[PDB]
Motif scaffolding. Structure first.
Motif, short mmCIF file in Angstrom:
data_model
loop_
_atom_site.label_atom_id
_atom_site.label_comp_id
_atom_site.label_asym_id
_atom_site.label_seq_id
_atom_site.Cartn_x
_atom_site.Cartn_y
_atom_site.Cartn_z
N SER A 297 52.02 39.25 32.67
CA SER A 297 52.03 39.34 34.13
C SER A 297 50.96 40.26 34.68
N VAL B 217 47.43 37.93 34.14
CA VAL B 217 47.37 36.91 35.18
C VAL B 217 47.01 37.53 36.54
N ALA B 218 47.21 38.83 36.72
CA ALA B 218 46.78 39.49 37.95
C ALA B 218 45.29 39.79 37.92
N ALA C 250 43.26 37.95 36.26
CA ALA C 250 42.66 36.62 36.34
C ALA C 250 42.53 36.12 37.77
N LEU C 251 43.34 36.62 38.70
CA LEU C 251 43.12 36.36 40.11
C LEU C 251 42.32 37.46 40.80
N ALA C 252 42.32 38.68 40.26
CA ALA C 252 41.51 39.74 40.86
C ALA C 252 40.03 39.52 40.60
N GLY D 137 38.75 36.61 39.77
CA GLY D 137 38.49 35.38 40.50
C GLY D 137 38.34 35.58 42.00
N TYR D 138 38.91 36.65 42.54
CA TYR D 138 38.69 36.99 43.95
C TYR D 138 37.31 37.59 44.15
#
Lengths: 33, 31
Positions: B19, B22-23, B25-27, B29-30
């Protein structure tokens, strides 16, 4: 400053040590009552 | 509060790391 950087190191080193001597005892008190 | 619930966090070890990665992986990606 050489003075405050060691007073804030002994008091930092003691509080991280107090969590260890309480952590290795309260977890021993918690496991297998 | 006591250490009665600070054992399941350890008990659920992989479910915390999966968990956090996956954070990131969006951070990233941001960015």
């Amino acid at each position: 400053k050489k003075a405050i950087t060691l007073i804030l190191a002994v008091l930092l080193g003691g509080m991280v040590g107090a969590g260890i001597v309480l952590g290795r005892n309260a977890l021993r008190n918690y496991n297998a009552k | 509060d006591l250490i009665d619930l600070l054992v399941q966090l350890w008990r659920g070890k992989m479910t915390i790391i999966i968990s956090v990665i996956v954070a990131i992986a969006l951070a990233i990606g941001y960015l």
